[PDB]
Design a protein around this ligand. Structure first.
Ligand SMILES: [Zn+2]
Ligand SMILES: [Zn+2]
Length: 374
């Protein structure tokens, strides 16, 4: 009925930088070999999407953004073997080709087939399945979830539980998985340990949740906005510290509080200064500090390697260090198994068409996470 031919639908198009999203009638081309066409059900608004808008994250324009979502597969191309029409699916902004050195390496997940490093803004074959008035529209990280229908390469989609709430499990496409994974997979937080999370936004809450899952005894939440503390404690935070309430430097406060430094610290804001703070505040001989996010508009941090010589470990990851296709389904499984909540993160729900409004909520910071329903 719809398989095999072009689909006319609405999508959120960004024609230029620092411009609101324009709701356009686009033509989504059918999936070629090893491609999957998805009917979007719910997509989240992540800060990285806003980074496209502000030109911070350089990627080809015009483009259809979005990378945190879920939906239903309407059809598949010839060769697609991992998903079938009707399957609930979550697109992967970080691929899992399962062939490159990385996918084969037990510690890597940043698949070399990604479009993050050197953005092309296309499907794997270098072309686009998007057109708006005959004009071509770029893809975003091989996902482009800001559309009623999108087309992704097979390596960029994972089949999930056929009974999962897409309005909720979409956070596994990025937000939740990133924070949670940073604690559980990346940092590998241990029981009885003390953790310090910098930034209590959606991702910070996910990290906290990861620490709580890992059995941390103390989860010190750090943020200058007191309004984020209740949600924090609610998700696991044992304590909350607002740096503006202190005269002494924050690492000094965190060091003393942890009687010598924390076990694991995570920076989730993307701030160069707090990145060094987080690192310092963890015990000098065996602390681990995790970089969960870094703003695209590159700027170097200034740090003394002496902080590392004593024994500290500094490391970051993308998508919580999870191998996308293998992890996503399991994470949805663990959600369906009540192993963690997603609702504490979902703070606003808007119809897809009010996307701009959702971004206004983001920029104002009065939002933890907005979900656009189609
Ligand atoms: Zn994201
Ligand atoms: Zn790969």
């Amino acid at each position: 009925s719809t398989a095999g031919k072009v689909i006319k639908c609405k999508a959120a198009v960004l024609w230029e930088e620092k411009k609101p999203f324009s709701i356009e009638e686009v033509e989504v081309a059918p999936p070629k070999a090893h491609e999957v066409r998805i009917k979007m059900v719910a997509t989240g608004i992540c800060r990285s999407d806003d980074h496209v808008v502000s030109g911070t994250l350089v990627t080809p324009l015009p483009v259809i953004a979005g990378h945190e979502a879920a939906g239903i597969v309407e059809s598949i191309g010839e060769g697609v073997t991992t998903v079938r029409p009707g399957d609930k699916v979550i697109p992967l902004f970080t691929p899992q080709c399962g062939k490159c050195r990385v996918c084969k390496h037990p510690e890597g997940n940043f698949c070399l087939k990604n479009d993050l490093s050197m953005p092309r803004g296309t499907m794997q074959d270098g072309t686009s399945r998007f057109t708006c008035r005959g004009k071509p529209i770029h893809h975003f990280l091989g996902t482009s979830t800001f559309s009623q229908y999108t087309v992704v390469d097979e390596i960029s989609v994972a089949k999930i539980d056929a009974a999962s709430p897409l309005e909720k499990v979409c956070l596994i496409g990025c937000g939740f998985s990133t924070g949670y994974g940073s604690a559980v997979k990346v940092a590998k937080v241990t029981q009885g340990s003390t953790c310090a999370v910098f930034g209590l936004g959606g991702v910070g809450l996910s990290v906290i949740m990861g620490c709580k899952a890992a059995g941390a005894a103390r989860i010190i939440g750090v943020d200058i906005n007191k309004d984020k503390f209740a949600k924090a404690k609610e998700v696991g935070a044992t304590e909350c510290v607002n740096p503006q309430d202190y005269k002494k430097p924050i690492q000094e406060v965190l060091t003393e509080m942890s009687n010598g430094g924390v076990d694991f610290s995570f920076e989730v804001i993307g701030r160069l200064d707090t990145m060094v703070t987080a690192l310092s505040c963890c015990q000098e001989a065996y602390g681990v500090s995790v970089i969960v996010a870094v703003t695209p508009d590159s700027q170097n941090l200034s740090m003394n390697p002496m902080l590392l010589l004593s024994g500290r470990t500094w490391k970051g990851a993308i998508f919580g260090g999870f191998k996308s296709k293998d992890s996503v389904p399991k994470l949805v499984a663990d959600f369906m198994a009540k192993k963690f909540a997603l609702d504490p993160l979902i703070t606003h729900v808007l119809p897809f068409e009010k996307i701009n409004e959702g971004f206004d909520l983001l920029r104002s910071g009065e939002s933890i996470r907005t979900i656009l329903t189609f």
